[PDB]
Amino acid sequence: LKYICAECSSKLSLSRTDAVRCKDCGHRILLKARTKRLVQFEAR
Amino acid sequence: KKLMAQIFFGPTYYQRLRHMVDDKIHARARGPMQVLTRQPVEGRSRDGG
Amino acid sequence: KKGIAKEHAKWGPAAAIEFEYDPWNKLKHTDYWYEQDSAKEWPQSKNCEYEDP
Amino acid sequence: PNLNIVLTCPECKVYPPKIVERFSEGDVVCALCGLVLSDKLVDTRSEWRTFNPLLDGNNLSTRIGKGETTDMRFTKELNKAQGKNVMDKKDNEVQAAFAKITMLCDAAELPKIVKDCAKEAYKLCHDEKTLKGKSMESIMAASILIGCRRAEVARTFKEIQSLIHVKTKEFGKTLNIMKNILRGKSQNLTYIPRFCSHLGLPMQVTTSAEYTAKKCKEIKEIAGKSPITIAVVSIYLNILLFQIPITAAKVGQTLQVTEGTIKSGYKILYEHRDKLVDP
Amino acid sequence: SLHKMSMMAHRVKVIPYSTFRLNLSVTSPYNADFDGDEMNLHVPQSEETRAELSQL
Amino acid sequence: MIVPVRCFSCGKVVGDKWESYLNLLQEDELDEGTALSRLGLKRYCCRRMILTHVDLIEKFLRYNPL
Amino acid sequence: RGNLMGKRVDFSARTVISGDPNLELDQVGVPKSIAKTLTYPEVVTPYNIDRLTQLV
Amino acid sequence: NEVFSRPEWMILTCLPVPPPPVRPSISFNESQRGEDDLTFKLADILKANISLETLE
Amino acid sequence: FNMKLAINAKTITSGLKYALATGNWGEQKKAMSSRAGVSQVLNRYTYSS
Amino acid sequence: NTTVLADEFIAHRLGLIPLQSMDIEQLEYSRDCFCEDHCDKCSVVLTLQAFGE
Amino acid sequence: NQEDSMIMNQSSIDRGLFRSLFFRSYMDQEKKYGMSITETFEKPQRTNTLRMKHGTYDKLDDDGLIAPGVRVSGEDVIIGKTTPISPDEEELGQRTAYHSKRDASTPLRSTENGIVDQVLVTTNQDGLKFVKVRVRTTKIPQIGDKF
Ligand SMILES: [Zn+2]
Ligand SMILES: [Zn+2]
Ligand SMILES: [Zn+2]
Ligand SMILES: [Zn+2]
């Protein structure tokens, strides 16, 4: 899971050229997969 | 305590302008330095004088 | 966490308050802006009747 | 002599010194020691933020036209008197060829990368007895194809010849000598999307074409003397695998290709259907 | 700056909550309402200049 | 945007009352001033918020993200 | 007119202003950030040795 | 003034050039130099000079 | 009758694109007889604006 | 987070939900607490779950 | 409030009167100066580059980008760039190794400190690697703001 590309939740897990135009979609803009890393906030 | 004079009071419509102080505060002591004229450079973003 | 209302309005329980003394202005701690009558142009306090006129 | 300066803290001296840049102060400090080294640094990014000589060469380019604070007759006088040194340099030929390849590349609606690569390819050789004239068409077409190919934009020789006819022979010899020159000084799968673009089909036939091209490349049957033809009949068997009327009689003049070669590829894939379909 | 004022000197009291801060009486020589105006500071660097700045 | 929680002036919680104030105007056909009164917001600093808050959140929400 | 007769300088600051009726005229309120950026040299004497030592 | 100003000094024959601190290569700060205006003009001058003298 | 009409296409496409991107109203010849503020960037701070 | 609603909205709007505080005196401040990082004897923990079902 | 200033309730600020978002983007892409091999979006380490800043490049990842949702302070870099030239004797001359950097990284603006939100990459007009990031900031009213 490394890229999104679309309304589809295609977790491309891209290394190089695995149909960036994702298979269920036809998009070619490749959005980038908000992290799993834990984030902090402050509700002051 | 009560105030003496009664005052005006009510709701009113405002809006918030973009000129916020955090983009206008700026200071410099001994920073970078221009090349053609050897002076403090311009630019609030560029840490100028 | 604990917190108190002084440093943020999160930690308030208060939410409103009310306060009134001498509803008939016997203490003369104010005088009324007016143009014909103080008495006519101002509404009576709700707490007027608990003290005599 | 070499005139060179390396910074060194005169009180730490323990290495090529581990120092840092305090860019907002314009100073350099020995980070281990804390003493300043030199002051009043010069800018390194605002000079770029303020706003090709190498392709154009050592001589300096000049786009000279007309201004605003002068009369139109004096601008015409300027245009007549500005043409007095167009023969001393060979740069006149350099920007002449540059203008020509600009016309050709932007007529072929190519990227600026391809344009600059062709500029580089011409500039690198640019004058040799190995060049030896060749009507400029051979060398310009060869440089354009080399630059466009090394920018990984593969274009067909038929399209290059349709844009500029270089009789397919001197073009080939010039390509070989450019190959040798660049060799001394030192992609078939990419053709398919342009053709399916010219036919207007979705992504899945393109992916099928890539898979079939790699698989038929892997096994056997080079089968065709520049097998771009069987690369095309890969799309032909893909669209026969689907049901959209893209008949070969249309396809032959759509791609300027032989229908008999199409049917021969259809036969040689008719006996070889076995392992060419993924799902 | 147009006339002899609008370069005048001050002592400094450091305050929190970043903005400048000055007395209301000195407002009209500066010719500056608080509608979003902005001032400038100039720190002297030596004893002579500090002295003549404070005394003039 | 949602209704605010907790009126800026006073502090009383608002936001429980929103969808109630909606359905007081959907089926009950009620006048809105009386609707806020029967909702029980007798000061007016609280009252301004429900009366003037606009709901952009659903207009945002009619996209199709992911 | 832009490099000799007037020029950029150093040691300066620029913010916006607001009133205050708790500063007398010769005073000016400065944010702690500005006073942390700006500076002013002092020469070390017998008189100020300890204070400057502490402040270092 | 004969010691400072002479009409035969008032015709250009031998031309000084200024060092690069007058006309610095701006060092374009992406990958290149983008080298500047005055030096372009001087290169023009010397080109026309050698053209004239070879033609002569 | 074919090769030059494509660079023709480049010329008119480049001209329109340049004029609208810049705002100078004239071809790529350093803006003779032209006007400046013709194609400003859209202001989008507020729907009313 | 996935929703159209922004993260610091979620933070700020969470921060304003009133909470049951009859027994507030029993625990003590996080600042004065002998512990570190929210022991049970200075703080409480809340968890939210949502789904676009 | 003399001369148009205002007194403003702190408690209303705390509840959320006049709060606001702030969206900033940045644009960067690889550039070709070739001999067509272009720049790269990698993660510059210490012994690869020259005169790179002190931005503490840890927030980046293996593909040279930052991840959405993390926080960034003032001086954190967000984009990693490296010089593909050649001809410079790129790792064999006039520099040690310190491989081929001449680092062209893009730091954040020196003051603000938001959270990285919605980073995308897609090729440009002609086909390159072309990057846009966006960072989001909360801006509570303060003393100097203007209404
Ligand atoms: Zn998709
Ligand atoms: Zn040292
Ligand atoms: Zn209220
Ligand atoms: Zn605890």
SS (H, E, C) H27-40: CCCCCCCCCCHHHH
Single-letter residue type at K91:
E
* Distance in angstroms (rounded) separating the CA atoms of residues D44 and D49: 10
Asked if A44 has any chain J CB less than 8 Å from its own CB, the reply is yes
Write out the two tokens for C18. Answer: 């009310």
> Are the beta carbons of K146 and G17 closer than 8 angstroms?
no
> Are the beta carbons of D134 and D177 closer than 8 angstroms?
no
> Are the beta carbons of K103 and K50 closer than 8 angstroms?
yes
* Distance in angstroms (rounded) separating the CA atoms of residues C20 and B2: 9
Task: Pick the closest to residue J9 from K94, K101, G41, K115 (CA basis).
Answer: K115
* Distance in angstroms (rounded) separating the CA atoms of residues H43 and H50: 11
Are β-strands B26-28 and D19-22 bridged in parallel, bridged antiparallel, or unpaired?
Answer: unpaired
Write out the two tokens for E7. Answer: 């370069």
Helices (H), chain C: 38-41
Write out the two tokens for D48. Answer: 């770029």
Q: How many whole angstroms from A28 Cα to the centroid of ligand 1?
A: 7
SS3 H1: coil
The CATH number of the domain holding residue A20 is 2.20.28.30
* Distance in angstroms (rounded) separating the CA atoms of residues K75 and K71: 12
SS3 K79: strand
Counting DSSP H helices and E strands in chain G, the numbers are 2, 2
Domain count of chain A? Answer: 1
Write out the two tokens for D115. Answer: 């344009």
Radius of gyration for the alpha carbons in chain D, expressed in angstroms and rounded: 29
Phi, psi of D67 (to 5 degrees): -105, -160
Q: How far is CA D165 from the centre of its chain?
A: 20
Beta bridge partners of A5: A9
Searching chain C, which residue's CA lies closest to the CA of residue J44? C1
Experimental technique, in short, is cryo-EM
Catalytic residue among K4, K58, K62, K126: K4
Task: Tell the residue number behind the tokens 């708790």, with chain if given.
Answer: G22
Radius of gyration for the alpha carbons in chain E, expressed in angstroms and rounded: 13
* Distance in angstroms (rounded) separating the CA atoms of residues F57 and F59: 5
**How many CB atoms within 10 Å of residue J45?**
6
Residues of C in contact with J42 (CB under 8 A): 1-2
Searching chain B, which residue's CA lies closest to the CA of residue G7? B39
Burial of residue K53 (CB within 10 Å: 0-12, 13-18, 19+) is middle
> Are the beta carbons of D139 and D131 closer than 8 angstroms?
yes
Name residues whose C-beta falls within 8 Å of residue D210's C-beta, 6 or more positions apart in sequence. D189, D192
* Distance in angstroms (rounded) separating the CA atoms of residues F8 and K103: 49
Residues of K in contact with F9 (CB under 8 A): 9, 12
* Distance in angstroms (rounded) separating the CA atoms of residues D229 and D158: 13
> Are the beta carbons of D107 and I10 closer than 8 angstroms?
yes
**How many CB atoms within 10 Å of residue I15?**
13
Burial of residue H3 (CB within 10 Å: 0-12, 13-18, 19+) is exposed
DSSP state string for I1-49: --HHHHHHHHHHHHHHHHHHHH---S-TTT-TT--STTSPPPP-SSS--
> Are the beta carbons of J39 and J33 closer than 8 angstroms?
yes
Residues of H in contact with K100 (CB under 8 A): none
SS3 G27: strand
Report, at the CATH architecture level, how domain K20-140 is classified.
Answer: Beta Barrel (2.40)
Is residue K4 among the annotated active site residues?
Answer: yes
Counting DSSP H helices and E strands in chain B, the numbers are 0, 1
Helices (H), G1-56: 32-37, 49-55
Q: Enumerate the known binding-site residues of D for Zn(2+).
A: 9, 12, 30, 33
**How many CB atoms within 10 Å of residue H21?**
9
> Are the beta carbons of D143 and D170 closer than 8 angstroms?
no
Please give, rounded to a whole number of angstroms, the shortest distance from the CA of A34 to a CA of chain C. Answer: 30
Q: How many whole angstroms from A13 Cα to the centroid of ligand 1?
A: 13
CB contact under 8 Å between K17 and F8, yes or no, is yes
Q: How far from K37 is each of A20, D116, D152, K49, K127, CA to CA, in Å?
A: 22, 12, 10, 18, 13
> Are the beta carbons of J27 and C2 closer than 8 angstroms?
yes
Task: Pick the closest to residue D107 from D175, D159, D65, D56 (CA basis).
Answer: D159
**How many CB atoms within 10 Å of residue K107?**
16
- Please provide the distance, in angstroms rounded to a whole number, between the alpha carbons at the two ends of chain A: 34
Name residues whose C-beta falls within 8 Å of residue K25's C-beta, 6 or more positions apart in sequence. K132, K133, K134, K135
The CATH number of the domain holding residue D216 is 1.10.472.10
Report, at the CATH architecture level, how domain F1-66 is classified.
Answer: Orthogonal Bundle (1.10)
> Are the beta carbons of D238 and D244 closer than 8 angstroms?
no
Task: Pick the closest to residue D256 from D162, D163, D187, D174 (CA basis).
Answer: D162
Phi, psi of F31 (to 5 degrees): -60, 140
Asked if K54 has any chain D CB less than 8 Å from its own CB, the reply is yes
> Are the beta carbons of D92 and D134 closer than 8 angstroms?
no
Phi, psi of A26 (to 5 degrees): -140, 10
Burial of residue D151 (CB within 10 Å: 0-12, 13-18, 19+) is buried
> Are the beta carbons of C7 and J34 closer than 8 angstroms?
no
DSSP state string for D208-271: HHHHHHHHHHHHS---SSSTHHHHHHHHHHHHHHTT----HHHHHHHTT--HHHHHHHHHHHHT
